[PDB]
Structures are given as C-alpha cells and as structure tokens.
Design a binder for these strands. Sequence first.
DNA 1: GACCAACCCT
DNA 2: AGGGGGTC
Length: 580
Amino acid sequence: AKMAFTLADRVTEEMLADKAALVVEVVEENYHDAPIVGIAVVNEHGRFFLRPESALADPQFVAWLGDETKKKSMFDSKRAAVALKWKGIELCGVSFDLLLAAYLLDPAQGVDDVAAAAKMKQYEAVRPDEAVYGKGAKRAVPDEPVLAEHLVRKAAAIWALERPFLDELRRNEQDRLLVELEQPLSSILAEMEFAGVKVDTKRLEQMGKELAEQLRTVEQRIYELAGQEFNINSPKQLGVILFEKLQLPVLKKTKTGYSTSADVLEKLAPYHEIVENILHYRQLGKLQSTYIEGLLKVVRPDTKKVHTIFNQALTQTGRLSSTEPNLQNIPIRLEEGRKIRQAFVPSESDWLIFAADYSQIELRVLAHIAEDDNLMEAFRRDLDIHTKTAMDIFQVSEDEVTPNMRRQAKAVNKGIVYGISDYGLAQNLNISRKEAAEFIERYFESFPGVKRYMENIVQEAKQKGYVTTLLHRRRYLPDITSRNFNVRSFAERMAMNTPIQGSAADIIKKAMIDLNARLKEERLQARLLLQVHDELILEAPKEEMERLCRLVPEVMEQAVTLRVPLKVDYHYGSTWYDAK
DNA sequence: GACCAACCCT
DNA sequence: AGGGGGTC
C-alpha cells in the first residue's frame, strides 16, 4: 500500500518550508564519520525523498539545515547532527525530538525506533527499522524504492505524532523537561562526542606490554600450583581444578556449575595459594582485554581520539550511558587499573584536563526530598556523612568511630539509597539477616524523615502508578502491586531509589546546560568532554584553569537550589589520572 | 547468534 | 539502585 511521495532529483524551494519533519538516515550503529544513506522531508507541501549526494551538495539545502528559524521534527536528532558534523554541516532548529519525547513519557518501553514510538499512539503505518534493514550479519541497506518508502513513512509518522506526544508531555508537566533540558542537552552531547577525547596510544601499548608479561608470569604460577595446564578462563576446567582436583569447599553453586566469583574466591584464599593468583590473573586480564585492547580497537588512527556515543534515551532513571567505548567505567578503585587514566590526555599542547564532581549528591538529594532534620543538619555542617552515620547508629562520639564502624555505616548509606533490605545489606557486609535488620532499624531511628520518605514514596507509587524526580521525570512501577514478594519488593526499591538517582541525573544535566551557556558567554575555549553521572570532565588551555576553578563548581552548585547546599570538588592536571 | 557469569564504573 | 569470553 505505497505512500505517496516525490523521489526528487533536485532540491526545490517547497522542500525548505519553515516547519518540517526531517529524516537523515544513518544506518551504521556507530554514527561517527558514517554514511548518510538517504534523506526525507515531509512538510505542508508534501513528502520528499532526496539522495544525500544531491541534497548535501546543494547550498540552499545545507543553509536550510543550518537555519535555526527553520524548525525540524526528528527522531534521534543527535545521530543526524553528529553524522552531519563529520561532513562539515550544521544542523540547527530541531524543535522536537520524538526519541526523547517517547523516552520521557515512558522509559520502560525501550523505544529505539520510530515504529516503537508510533505504536504508543496506535500509529502503525511505518515499519520497524529491524524489518527494513534486517539484523546481525544480514544487516543491509535495501534498494532505493524500499529505502525511500521507509524513510518517508518515518518522516510522515514524526509529522503525525508531534502533536499527540507534546499534548501528553504537557499533561504530565514534562513539556519543559523536553524543550528546555533534554533537547538542548542533546546538542551539548553531540559537541562532546564529536570533539572526542585524545588518547596516548603509545602509553597504552607499553602498558599492554607490561601486562602481557605479568600475565605470563601469573599464568605459569597457576599451572605450577594446579600441577597442570588448563584454560583458566573456562568455568568447566577451573571448576574441576578448584573444587575437584584441589577439593576447595563449594560455597556457591551457579545455575550451570560451581561459582568462581571474586567474593567466593576471597573466602577460599586461606585454603590454597592458587586462589590469590587466579584473582590477580583476572584483574590483569580484565585490564588487558577490556581496557588496553578494547580501547586501542576503538581509537581513530587519524586523530588518536576515542569518540563515545552517549545514549540519552536508555536508562530507566534519567542517567546517560556511554558506549564504544564506555568512558563511564574507566578503572579508578585499584591503583594498578587507575593508571589507565594516564592514557587520556588533552587534545592540544599546553591544555589540561579539569574534573569537577558533586560530593554525595544522592544523599544530599535524599536529605532534601525526605526533609530529614538530622540529615539536612549533617549536610549544612558539611560533615563527613559516613562518620556521622556511624556516630548515630552506634551511639558513639566521633573519637570512638573505628575504621570498621565507618565502613559499615557507609554500606548502610548505600543501602538506604538503593532501597535495600535486611537481606541485601547482609550480603554486602557479610553478616546475618537479623544483624542487618538491626542496622536499618537504628538508621531509621536516627533518620526518621528518611523512614517517613521511604514509606510515603512506596504508597505514592502504588496510588499514582509511578514516581517522579525533581524536574518531573517519571518512572512507571506496575510491579508495585504484585502479589509476588520478590517482584513487589524490587519495585518498592525502585520507588525509593528512582527519585534520588533520577533527581541527581536531572541536576547534573541542568549543570551541563548552564555550563555550556557560561563558557560561551565568557568566550572560554574550555570544552566539555565527558559526563560520568556526578562528574564533568573538561579540557582547556592552562591559562583558563584559574577561571575554571571558580566557574565550574559554582555553575554545578547553583544548578538547582535544594534545602541543603550542593558541594563540588575539582582537580586538574596533565592527564585524567592527574586530575585528582 | 544468544546467553550467562563475571567484573568494571557511579 | 543504574549501566557496558566460553558455552551451547
């Protein structure tokens, strides 16, 4: 049932209306320096398909793309915007992004194409991308009539669905969240991804060489200690060596066999010297395969940069994620892995890396939303929150908090944030369930506002069907009324955690927007490179460091006003590693 | 190609 | 709480 459209050979004026749905199709998953395979425009004058070689060489089309007063409705405008950046072309005037609209309305739908968004409004006259392009090894751009019809159907769907999505967003009080936060963020993210992060590949290659050697040493030790050679990475062979040949106790069983997770191996260590070597082996192998080799695979040889993609429409809480590479999980906890960060360097000579991070943003949001007097006081006094929680739950003075007490109060604080239960805290602290329940009980005795919040939010999630964040992000929790304890309990944890994690995500997004405007106003050459949930990483000329020291924390702290202050710490240095 | 245990981050 | 090799 073909949809009517003009398969245009040249760009004409009626294609350049000041309101249109626009599709700029980039089929490669990684859109950096990738082909644009076709273009489609739908507006008041009709529906059009243009070949990219024609349209992107046409000066009037390029000027239309870059004209802020010519409004476009798209799906996943950052994909388009980034692909066009690599071709030297600017995309402006995107006033509606259907991907981001669908994500705000319900993140649980997993909307990743136009067809999935359209289904939300009983619009089905468009195919899923997976049906048009196929999947896996059979993934292919189809021939032009099939391609052109698909792109026009997508554009037509966008044109049809804008009004219904914006109506619903408004009813939800999410219209400003789309227009003033997620859409402008999307363009900031596009700049970040495009700029990329410079990598010292030589330093990485030498790290790889050293690891290679330490891995050979530990691997031989392991075969010496096992008394035979085997695939250390094989769960079958390793399970046989540990739990049969060597008779180590079986403390945990996997669905398919013996468990060898790090928590289990740490318990087995006293019984045999093989265990610490296996652990060290896995630590090095992780660094080698994921971080040295993985990173070296994705660095662009021409520029020596990595260009991540930030998925802004994926997480259930409002966080971003990062892929190919993931720059939000670069090792930091153990010193040997943290050195990987010495390979991330400024993109120009005499530039430095600058990192700013919120101090305990999740707990401070909790203090604000729960209005707990004790917690709010703690933050208003800028106390070490974990020491203070130790003092209250153990009923001791600051002098009497031992390192183990602080470690445990810390785990409780994480637990309260992730809404965990006597059971989940017990596993984390390696203790009994009754003991955990005693900690939680003491916590709530000291922070009765937090308890009140946890109760109130679970009830609100049951009453309304969802919970919300500070800036009106939403998460639907239909399992909250389940009669199955485990399923219900998980939904309740989500009710408790989501306004905390999600409101934190809202605040840092708003900081990024405010910061980008300030950097411009000041005409600084400093640029945002990365976000890592509660921190922003920038590069700038050494001559701008002193100004950034004042400017960046202040923008991040003033992003919203909460009942308690926000606090931002910062550092800078020659490499990401040194920015500590 | 798809899963799953495993492990890196906040 | 939220993400991003071996074995069939």
